Amino acid sequence: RPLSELVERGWAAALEPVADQVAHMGQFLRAEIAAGRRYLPAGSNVLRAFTFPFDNVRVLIVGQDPYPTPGHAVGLSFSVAPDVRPWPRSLANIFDEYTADLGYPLPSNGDLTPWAQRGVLLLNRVLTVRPSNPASHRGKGWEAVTECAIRALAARAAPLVAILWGRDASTLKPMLAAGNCVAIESPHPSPLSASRGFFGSRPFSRANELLVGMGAEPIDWRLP
Ligand SMILES: O=c1[nH]cc([N+](=O)[O-])c(=O)[nH]1
Ligand SMILES: [Cl-]
Numbered sequence: 001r002p003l004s005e006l007v008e009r010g011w012a013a014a015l016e017p018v019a020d021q022v023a024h025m026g027q028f029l030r031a032e033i034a035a036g037r038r039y040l041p042a043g044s045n046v047l048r049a050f051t052f053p054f055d056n057v058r059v060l061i062v063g064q065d066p067y068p069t070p071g072h073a074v075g076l077s078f079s080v081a082p083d084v085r086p087w088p089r090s091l092a093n094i095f096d097e098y099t100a101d102l103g104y105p106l107p108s109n110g111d112l113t114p115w116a117q118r119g120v121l122l123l124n125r126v127l128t129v130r131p132s133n134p135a136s137h138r139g140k141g142w143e144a145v146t147e148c149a150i151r152a153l154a155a156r157a158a159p160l161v162a163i164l165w166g167r168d169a170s171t172l173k174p175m176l177a178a179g180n181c182v183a184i185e186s187p188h189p190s191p192l193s194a195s196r197g198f199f200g201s202r203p204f205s206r207a208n209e210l211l212v213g214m215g216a217e218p219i220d221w222r223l224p
């Protein structure tokens, strides 16, 4: 199936340069299932970040790989389905910062769909994983796909704030080089690092400060 059938119109055009690569990933995934390996998220969710309009994106929040725990990954970085509990600890930490930064109550559940609807791109660098095997689809072909996506996003005339959590995300700074882009960076929300620079970083309000200063509307971050 061609890109225009899988993703939103603007993303299909942005991702044209990697259309063959995306087809190849579908072949890889089929071969995984034929070899008796599973993958997450569900097939229908793999490209989900690209189902929300390319032109509407104002904030990029980069992830690395999908959650490897069965039933967690949903195709948007960090998000979980509404019935998932307890929250993955990175997400719980994200939510702690959300409350402290913004003053909102704890969200009711871990579903970040409203952010995606509002132009927050929840993009993992690698879009699939074998269950219980963290980072197991590194090097399988997604990195070129998601690099194309980020470069296309950065090339738009429109404002963009990139939120870069952890060392691997910070290495994308070169590709956000353009005057229309601005990166904020901190240690990752995982418990390993969170108290050494993530908590108190105020990424949500600062992203809004930056967008307003670039002439854009702020993100309404409020979750149910
Ligand atoms: O979808 C994701 N969920 C969580 C992480 N993480 O905590 O590193 C990530 O990189 N991507
Ligand atoms: Cl498996």
Ligand SMILES: [Cl-]
Binding pocket: 102, 219, 220, 221, 222
């Ligand atoms: Cl807000």
